[PDB]
Ligand binder design. Structure first.
Ligand code: CDL
Ligand code: 3PE
Ligand code: 3PE
Ligand code: 3PE
Ligand code: HEC
Ligand code: HEM
Ligand code: HEM
Ligand code: HEM
Ligand code: UQ6
Ligand code: UQ6
Lengths: 240, 373, 98, 24, 55, 76, 41, 49, 68, 184
């Protein structure tokens, strides 16, 4: 369809063996927790996934115990809410998608767990969308609950612009400029959509080193066992 | 052991042509890819659940919580892509070098090709993403085209009014069971070939120059396996989503339709043809013929030379055929609008006219040039 | 037409492997019957030429240009023997038809 | 007969002596 | 739509103009001869199933 | 199987042991010339179909864009 | 030449050298490879 | 095909025709029965139902 | 103390280039056109998409060097 | 014809002894039972879900809502029982008539017997009843007996501390895949 195509940004993980910047993933998780978690869900990400990536065991335990999670039927036979555990997943904003429709003027905020993977050119798109709430031009008019984001399909995203400069304060203190926040949350969402990005690239580096060792050696063995024929000299000697 | 005899009869003391190029590696690669797929598929089956509530959750659990489960899943997906790459190059080798005169081997081949396409289609339906669900409905709908029994057949396969859990579970069963039938058909494929032996790129009788297979075409197959593994692991470990679609990472929404619906890239050539024919039924038929035209290929050989090594006009026609196959692969991707449509219509007309008409006439002309006709 | 046939003979490329035209025929039933009816010396030269072409294709080489098969020189030896096979074949077919 | 010609030269192939065999 | 029977059950209301044009449509010239009212008990109310006849 | 494959006569065949011959005799010495020799015997048969595929692909893209580009005369 | 006569000529020893080498190769490869990856990122 | 445009070839077929029809008939009956095709089976008085 | 979003400073620095100011000139004419013609359905998206495409291309050329 | 040659040599003209009794039928019955099991198993696989929340529900849905699904399920269960009846009588024929002197055939047989027992065990675990779960724990525990690597092996198979969903799903995969290895 007719849509603005987000440009290519020089990400720190854009390279072939380039891993993710984990401080940026920590800052983007803070951005999600303070801003994006009010409407969007992360159903396939738990707190224990943050251990060894952005936070330690005790920091992630404190982060999990900051929230409340209904957990099981009491012996008395009823529900109850408990502080989150490292095994708890990220809390739902709404109990069901129809509540999300009712609370967001008919629009459904999608799962942001795989948003980067699910959106064509996601990392860019995300950054662009979050930073692309430009004014609608003449000739186009949008109804309430809509915003002209060139990048968003149709340029009418129900989501209002969620990142105002200094929307939240980074604990690290890095200036919380809108951009610094959009880049951090794009790195984090990326991490979310692929927690193994780093581990894999290490496997790929070992694979390239092993193939660079093994391909000329197997080629040399093949050319040994095929030299015999490749030197064979045929001669026709009719008895004449 | 008597078996050792069979073990030797097909892999050690088999008389193979000494001059077969690297293209003859590809079929062995396909067998390796089949095993790889089966092995990876088995390790996807120990954690996948074929329930519409839990299929996407099980796939994410494989990618996030199973130790190296992302590795096995993306190896399975990119190994399906590598399977179709090796399959297309195997079929192109068979078309170029006149190997279709081994008619039984060719027909067992086109049966294997149909089975592999069905297996890959149902496997792509299996993760139950947005793209899988709309893709399934689309092709299942293809069947409805049938003139009289179409509706019933579609509903049968779906197992209900519309694809829903009923489909997913039976698609899991069929996607599980068909690669073993593919392995048995590949054993029949190997048998129907050893009766005649492999062909050589010159297309001549290679009985005067044959060598063993163990030390000459085994280390060659090992080197080809190593190169194919290099390409597969650089596809998995570095660009794991360059061949897939991003919209498959969203859950299946029956209410939300995607703006543009595609199958995966190796179905595109067919997709183009289907879209090209205005009539729905026509499209389905042409689509089928697209694959079937190959089976029809051994009856269209009108030349006195088996291979295309000494046939330059038919070489030009062959590379034009590869060219508009690539064009049809591109068009499928493009959306419905000018001028993508016209190209699609022509490209399909040119594809069927080159395979059906132009190559036998060119072979007759080439026989006339050598004072044979 | 004669010069364009020489150009096509160079473009076909079996002369660079030292082959004749009749060496490049696909061995159907009639072609194998015509090959079986060849004299021993012609059959031995044909088998040596095919073996040398297979060896050259194995090493991805061609003959030197002085050793190629000149279009004018190529001899259609199997042709005479082949026509007969076809003639006999057709005669038999016709008999059955009738 | 069988002595008319001698084994063709493989010098462009042959490497450049049991002493060496062990290494080779 | 309410996803009736696993398929989008389009239910729509039409405007004076909406209802007016559909009637104006040439039934015979329609790819499928079925005048707007032929498929609706109420001109202001049209109900359809969301499966493209095509695929 | 071997032994009953074919009948040849008087075709002598000399060969050398793998360990006795260099592994890559003149590999880049003649390999390059040969690879180049090869490419010039097949490039005219192979390349021009893919060249016109590239032209048709670009053309389609640009044509499509122009198609999408608004008609200035329209809406005025 | 000594190596061939000692660990590469008898197939049993050939296997021994292979297995032992592989046992250590992993240590070296992993170590070296990791160094590189870390340096890169 | 040249060989198949023949006089005896024709005779053979003519002699073979009746048998061929019988086989199609068996299949047709078979298909009707196997599929429980009712459009056709509705014609048969007893089979009805 | 306004926290400067480097993105803004890069945005007007990139709008000082020539393809952006030409597309903005068409944008202006386009918008003026739509404004001048009181009743019309000719939007300025295409122009606006071209201006945003050029501007965000040169923004994405040099944005990330100013972000920690 | 190279595909039909096999049948002619093997099924159509194979020279067989004229005096073999009805006991020699049983092995062919086993092959038929194998197919029957595979066919019924395939038609159980189009509706079964290998999730511990839904496995019992899927089995009851097969028995109650799928058209003739009770027929295919009880055919599968009693065909496993018929498979073991024919297997025991086949082994008894081999023991009684001295057929174990065909040593390679006998060893491939006892490999087939081990594979069939493993397949039936995991298949009985598959419906996730009370008896299936306690039966699985029991035999999986059998492995723990191993002197040194036992604990690990058990945990591996279970895929966790104790049989739970982790097991059910991998048991579904293994129970699916082993009858084709049995056919080979
Ligand atoms: C060109 C520059 C080099 C050069 O001039 O050398 C001459 C040489 C050509 O020599 P020649 O005398 O013309 O032919 C004899 C060959 O060299 C004889 O060797 P070959 O090239 O026929 O080898 C068999 C072939 C067999 O190839 C295969 O096995 C292909 C298997 C299928 C494709 C790969 C699987 C994945 C496919 C995905 C699509 O293996 C290769 O293609 C090369 C493998 C290199 C491994 C890494 C070495 C470092 O050039 C090459 O060998 C090119 C390939 C190696 C680079
Ligand atoms: C790609 C180009 C590969 C190439 O190098 O082309 C030249 C090569 C020449 O082959 P030839 O003339 O036989 O001589 C070889 C021995 N000297 O020509 C060849 O390599 C011929 C290769 C035959 C197989 C080509 C398959 C290409 C992909 C086809 C996919 C579609 C197939 C049909 C699908 C339906
Ligand atoms: C051909 C004229 C004569 C050319 C002579 C060239 C000089 C030859 C003498 C000097 C040696 C140069 C190198 C020689 C290499 C081997 C010989 C050779 O290449 O010959 C020319 C080649 C084959 O020639 P030949 O088959 O003998 O007869 C030509 C029939 N046109 O033919 C060619 O090279 C040209 C082939 C052109 C093919 C163009 C295909 C365009 C269409 C592609 C469509 C792709 C799909 C498009 C979309 C379809 C769907 C809409
Ligand atoms: C049950 C009784 C079956 C029976 O009829 O027993 C007598 C029968 C006599 O057989 P025979 O003496 O060989 O003469 C046959 C030709 N007149 O002897 C036989 O029938 C021999 C039958 C051999 C197979 C019997 C299998 C019985 C069940 C064995 C289960 C356990 C097998 C081992 C498991 C480990
Ligand atoms: C933290 C800064 C973020 C980020 C990175 C995103 N959002 Fe939201 N969002 C909200 C709603 C109601 C929607 C749906 C609107 C509609 O569909 O019309 C969205 C949507 C998104 C997307 C998806 C875009 C797409 O093409 O589908 C993305 C990538 C996205 N957002 C990013 C609601 C909210 C909030 C409540 C006001 C806030 C806070 C956020 N979003 C925050 C963020
Ligand atoms: C008998 C062996 C096989 C088994 C047990 C098997 C099993 C599975 C399972 C459980 C899945 C779902 C997990 C996932 O989403 O990746 C799957 C997916 C898939 N399989 Fe297989 N498979 C087998 C062979 C094959 C073969 C031979 C092909 C190729 C034709 C294939 C193609 C696919 C594809 C394309 C997917 C979808 C991958 C995706 O989610 O993108 N499988 N398979
Ligand atoms: C399931 C995937 C397939 C496998 C595993 C497979 C396996 C093989 C193997 C091992 C060979 C012998 C080695 C070789 O020549 O490459 C071979 C050859 C061959 N295959 Fe396949 N094949 C497959 C698909 C096909 C298809 C789809 C066709 C038909 C288009 C086909 C037709 C042939 C032919 C004609 C040969 C003979 C090669 C020659 O002598 O030139 N194969 N195949
Ligand atoms: C590849 C073919 C097969 C498939 C796809 C398959 C699939 C299944 C499925 C889905 C179930 C669960 C449904 C149920 O509870 O009955 C099941 C159960 C079972 N299967 Fe299979 N099966 C296959 C072959 C076999 C074979 C060969 C055996 C015999 C060794 C076997 C023995 C069993 C048993 C004993 C059960 C438990 C039945 C019960 O609930 O009482 N299956 N199979
Ligand atoms: C010399 O002629 C032969 C040949 O004899 C054989 C057996 C093979 C078969 C080689 C393979 C390893 C391919 C494997 C084929 C299968 C049967 C696939 C089945 C897969 C399994 C799951 C087992 C050839 O490819 C071949 O030509 C090169
Ligand atoms: C005469 O000697 C033979 C014999 O030649 C054969 C082939 C069979 C095999 C007969 C069968 C029908 C059993 C089927 C065996 C299998 C291979 C089972 C595999 C099952 C499939 C899923 C296929 C015999 O049982 C037999 O002795 C009676």
């Amino acid at each position: 369809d007719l849509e603005l195509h987000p440009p290519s940004y020089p990400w720190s993980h854009r390279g072939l063996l380039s891993s993710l910047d984990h401080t940026s993933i920590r800052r983007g998780f803070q951005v999600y927790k303070q801003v994006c978690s009010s409407c969007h869900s992360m159903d396939y990400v738990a707190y224990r996934h943050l251990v060894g990536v952005c936070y330690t065991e005790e920091e992630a335990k404190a982060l999990a115990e900051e929230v409340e999670v209904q957990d099981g039927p009491n012996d008395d036979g009823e529900m109850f809410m408990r502080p989150g555990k490292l095994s708890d997943y990220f809390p739902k904003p709404y109990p069901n998608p129809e509540a999300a429709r009712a609370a967001n003027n008919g629009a459904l905020p999608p799962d942001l767990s795989y948003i980067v993977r699910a959106r064509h050119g996601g990392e860019d798109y995300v950054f662009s969308l979050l930073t692309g709430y430009c004014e609608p031009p003449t000739g186009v008019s949008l109804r309430e609950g809509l915003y002209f984001n060139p990048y968003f399909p149709g340029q009418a995203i129900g989501m209002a612009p969620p990142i105002y400069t200094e929307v939240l304060e980074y604990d690290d203190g890095t200036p919380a400029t809108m951009s610094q926040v959009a880049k951090d949350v794009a790195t984090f969402l990326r991490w979310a959509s692929e927690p193994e990005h780093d581990h894999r690239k290490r496997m790929g580096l070992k694979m390239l080193l092993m193939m660079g060792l093994l391909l000329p050696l197997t080629y040399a063995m093949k050319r040994h066992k095929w030299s015999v024929l490749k030197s064979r000299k045929l001669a026709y000697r009719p008895p004449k | 052991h008597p078996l050792f005899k069979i073990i030797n009869h097909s892999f050690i003391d088999l008389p193979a042509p000494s001059n077969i190029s690297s293209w003859w590696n590809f079929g062995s690669l396909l067998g390796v890819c089949l095993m790889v797929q089966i092995i990876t598929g088995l390790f996807l089956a120990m954690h996948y659940t074929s329930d519409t509530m839990t299929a996407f959750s099980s796939v994410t659990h494989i990618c996030r919580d199973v130790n190296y489960g992302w590795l096995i899943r993306y190896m399975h997906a990119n190994g399906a892509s590598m399977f179709f790459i090796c399959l297309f190059l195997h079929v192109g080798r068979g078309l170029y070098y006149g190997s279709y005169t081994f008619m039984e081997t060719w027909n067992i081949g086109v049966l294997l090709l149909f089975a592999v396409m069905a297996t890959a289609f149902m496997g792509y339906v299996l993760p139950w993403g947005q793209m899988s669900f709309w893709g399934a409905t689309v092709i299942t709908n293809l069947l409805s085209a049938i003139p009289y029994i179409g509706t019933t057949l579609v509903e049968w396969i779906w197992g209900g009014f519309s694809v829903d859990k009923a489909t997913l579970t039976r698609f899991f069963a069929f996607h599980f069971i068909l690669p073993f039938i593919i392995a048995a058909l590949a054993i029949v494929h190997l048998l129907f070939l050893h009766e005649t032996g492999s062909n050589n790129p010159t297309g001549l009788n290679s009985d005067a120059d044959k060598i063993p297979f163990h030390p000459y075409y085994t280390i060659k197959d090992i080197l080809g396996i190593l190169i194919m593994f290099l390409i597969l692991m650089t596809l998995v470990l570095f660009f794991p989503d360059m061949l897939g679609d991003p919209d498959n990472y969203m859950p299946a929404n029956p209410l939300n339709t995607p703006p543009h619906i595609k199958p995966e890239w190796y179905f595109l050539f067919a997709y183009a043809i289907l879209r090209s024919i205005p009539n729905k039924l026509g499209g389905v038929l042409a689509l089928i013929l697209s694959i079937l035209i190959l089976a029809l290929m051994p009856f269209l050989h009108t030349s006195k030379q088996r291979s295309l090594m000494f046939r330059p006009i038919t070489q030009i026609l062959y590379w034009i055929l590869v060219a508009n196959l690539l064009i049809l692969t591109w068009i499928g991707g493009q959306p419905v609008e000018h001028p993508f449509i016209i190209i699609g219509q022509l490209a399909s007309i040119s594809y069927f006219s080159i395979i059906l008409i132009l190559m036998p006439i060119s072979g007759i002309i080439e026989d006339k040039m050598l004072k044979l006709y | 037409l004669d010069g364009f046939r020489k150009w096509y003979y160079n473009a076909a490329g079996f002369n660079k492997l030292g082959l004749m035209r009749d060496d490049t025929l696909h061995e159907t039933e009639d072609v194998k019957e015509a090959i079986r009816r060849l004299p021993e010396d012609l059959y031995n030269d044909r088998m040596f030429r095919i073996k040398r072409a297979l060896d050259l294709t194995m090493r991805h080489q061609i003959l030197p240009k002085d050793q190629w098969t000149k279009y004018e020189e190529d001899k259609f030896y199997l042709e005479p023997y082949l026509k007969e096979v076809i003639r006999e074949r057709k005669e038999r077919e016709e008999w059955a038809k009738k | 007969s069988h002595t008319d010609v001698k084994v063709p030269d493989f010098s462009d192939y042959r490497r450049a002596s049991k002493e060496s065999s062990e290494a080779r | 739509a309410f996803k009736w029977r696993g398929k989008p059950l389009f239910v729509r209301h039409r405007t004076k103009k909406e209802i007016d044009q559909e009637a104006a449509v040439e039934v015979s010239q329609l790819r499928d001869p079925q005048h707007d009212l032929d498929r609706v008990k109420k001109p202001e109310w049209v109900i359809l199933i969301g499966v493209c006849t095509h695929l | 199987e071997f032994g009953n494959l074919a009948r040849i006569r008087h075709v002598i065949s000399y060969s050398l042991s793998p360990f006795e011959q260099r592994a890559f005799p003149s590999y880049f010495s003649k390999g390059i010339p040969n690879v180049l020799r090869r490419t010039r015997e097949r490039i005219l048969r192979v390349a021009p179909p893919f060249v016109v595929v590239y032209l048709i692909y670009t053309w389609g893209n640009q044509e499509f864009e122009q198609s999408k580009r608004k008609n200035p005369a329209m809406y005025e | 030449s000594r190596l061939y006569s000692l660990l590469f000529r008898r197939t049993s020893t050939f296997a021994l050298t292979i297995a032992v080498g592989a046992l250590f190769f992993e240590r070296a490869f992993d170590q070296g490879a990791d160094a590189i990856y870390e340096h890169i990122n | 095909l040249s060989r198949f445009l023949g006089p005896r070839y024709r005779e053979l077929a003519r002699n073979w025709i009746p048998t061929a029809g019988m086989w199609g008939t068996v299949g047709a009956v078979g298909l009707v029965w196997a599929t429980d095709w009712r459009l056709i089976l509705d014609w048969v008085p007893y089979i009805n139902g | 103390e306004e926290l400067v979003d480097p993105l803004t400073t890069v945005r007007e620095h990139c709008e000082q280039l020539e393809k952006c100011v030409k597309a903005r000139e068409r944008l202006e004419l386009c918008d003026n056109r739509v404004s001048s013609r009181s009743q019309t359905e000719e939007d300025c998206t295409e122009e606006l998409f071209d201006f945003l495409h050029a501007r965000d291309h040169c923004v994405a050329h040099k944005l990330f060097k100013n972000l920690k």
